[PDB]
Write a protein that binds this ligand. Structure first.
Ligand SMILES: CS(=O)(=O)NCc1ccc(Cl)cc1CC(=O)Nc1cncc2ccccc12
Ligand SMILES: CS(=O)(=O)NCc1ccc(Cl)cc1CC(=O)Nc1cncc2ccccc12
Ligand SMILES: [Cl-]
Lengths: 305, 297
């Protein structure tokens, strides 16, 4: 019993964190086999950030301009290349702690664990979701650039995010491990603002199924809804549209609890209309959207209370 | 910017998790040097049950390797299994007993394999609001101070309300609980006042100031009000501990207490603080300073 915002154990990722220094800038890098991956803005000064020409800044660098530190050991850089917004530093030592891994690009709504780091040293781990507006509501200070997001389903680490910047509203933007940004963002100091964010509907429904599994039904009602009527109501509360893919994905949780997806949708419509009236759902007075259907199945019991 | 329920990096603890099996029961153990620590209920009159067991009755698995048990002893509610192999991954560590209101990270494990990490607090009623299923027994709670892991909790049981109970690593339970199937219930819980105040300071550091007001209060008047809402009493030690956050934000502790009083008496009025519509009490003053400063391990 219980339901917590649970992160994956971070040990496999901790063994990959290194410090990358280029001139006066110091940030984090991810050391996998003989390559260190880090944000390409490590080669920039603060002046450079308005309109940086990364190709021009990089051509002026040699391998020995990049200092890479792994624990108390200095790694030797023997090659460098840029792939989109990521710099790849070839080093002369393969990481003996390299776990089984993959680079995966995630979609809005997907969750992942973040290992926040400073100076190549891990400080904390938390769980978060890729928002519909492609930002993440992280907890990051200056020096956290290069910190990574990941999932560890089975024994394989799937790296999905690398931290690049904080937007004016305090939210965060970054790339996949191939250097492609999530969202319409650029690694440039320009007028960039997060688009209006929305609630991840399929995740709120998954979390309502989690509450039913753990023994709570106060929010259910005798009604059902069509998918279209639910979406017309949901969009008035800034909720993301629910698609047939989302309905199909909630199938297993629907069969485990005996509550049809459109019946759970009707309960969500009523909660949006009434609020909680002094009650909580899984210890929260707000509707939680940072647990996916997959997270609920992983954390919750297979037997409903 | 941002404020998350952040756990310590779990790698140093992951390298200590093992599976302990005794007959039909399988649970988790903590392997430090040549000893495996686990709940004694893996085997009631525990001395009588233990005397009937030999070393080979305990099966200890570390990854894909079977460890050989060469000795066994009981310390309070923890069983200590002496193994032939010292854990090469043993970190620098201490066993520490924590107090209600203090927080820690939990590495939830099943079959000696870590599945997740989350942050939680020892409630005033000595239970923890964890997330555990059958097989989680032996999972541990810890903090990291510099490069040293301070083990503070070992999971033993779930109570009827869905909350959890366990011991320190010396086998002493937190709370009036016993390790057996009998009628046990968590006492009425209270809110950790010093932690709510620390979280209000974290919200101010992050730009959330709508709840600040021009008023102050005496410590006695605040405690009379706090007692009415099932909040733990605030002591002068708590006021002293909040000193640094008070100097950083410019808001006196009793000034923040007057904000907390108004929130208790009137509610949030449709507003949120750090994305929450409830007053959060599972961040200590030290957790706030660490997360708003970047301390690494
Ligand atoms: C150097 S500048 O032109 O003033 N702007 C910095 C900058 C521009 C464009 C990019 Cl892609 C990256 C940066 C650096 C950057 O945003 N760092 C940070 C990352 N995460 C959290 C932070 C919290 C507080 C301060 C900085 C933080
Ligand atoms: C095993 S028994 O003696 O029959 N009764 C249970 C019991 C009594 C006394 C003790 Cl010290 C331990 C137990 C077992 C126990 O509480 N396990 C669990 C721990 N955490 C989460 C759980 C979720 C679902 C089921 C069990 C869970
Ligand atoms: Cl995805």
């Amino acid at each position: 019993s219980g339901f917590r915002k649970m992160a994956f154990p971070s040990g496999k990722v901790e063994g990959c964190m290194v410090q990358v220094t280029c001139g006066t800038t110091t940030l984090n890098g991810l050391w996998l086999d003989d390559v260190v991956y880090c944000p390409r803005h490590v080669i920039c000064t603060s002046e450079d950030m308005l309109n940086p020409n990364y190709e021009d800044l990089l051509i002026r660098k040699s391998n020995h301009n990049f200092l890479v530190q792994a624990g108390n050991v200095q790694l030797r850089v023997i090659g460098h290349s840029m792939q989109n917004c990521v710099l790849k530093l070839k080093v002369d030592t393969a990481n003996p702690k390299t776990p089984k891994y993959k680079f995966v690009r995630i979609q809005p709504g997907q969750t992942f664990s973040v290992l926040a780091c400073y100076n190549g040293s891990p400080s904390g781990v938390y769980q978060c979701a890729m928002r519909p507006n492609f930002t993440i509501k992280g907890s990051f200070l200056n020096g956290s650039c290069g910190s990574v997001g990941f999932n560890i389903d089975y024994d394989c680490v799937s790296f999905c995010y690398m931290h690049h910047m904080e937007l004016p509203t305090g939210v965060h933007a970054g790339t996949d491990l191939e250097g492609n940004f999530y969202g319409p963002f650029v690694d440039r100091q320009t007028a960039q603002a997060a688009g209006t964010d929305t609630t991840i509907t399929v995740n709120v429904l998954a979390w309502l199924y989690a509450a039913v599994i753990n023994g709570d039904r106060w929010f259910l009602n005798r009604f059902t809804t069509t998918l279209n009527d639910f979406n017309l109501v949901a969009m008035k509360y800034n909720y993301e549209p629910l698609t047939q893919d989302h309905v199909d994905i909630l199938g297993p949780l629907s069969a485990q609890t005996g509550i049809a997806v459109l019946d759970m949708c009707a309960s969500l419509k009523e909660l949006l209309q009434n609020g909680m009236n002094g009650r909580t759902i899984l210890g929260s007075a707000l509707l939680e959207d940072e647990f996916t259907p997959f997270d609920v199945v992983r954390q919750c019991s297979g037997v409903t209370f």
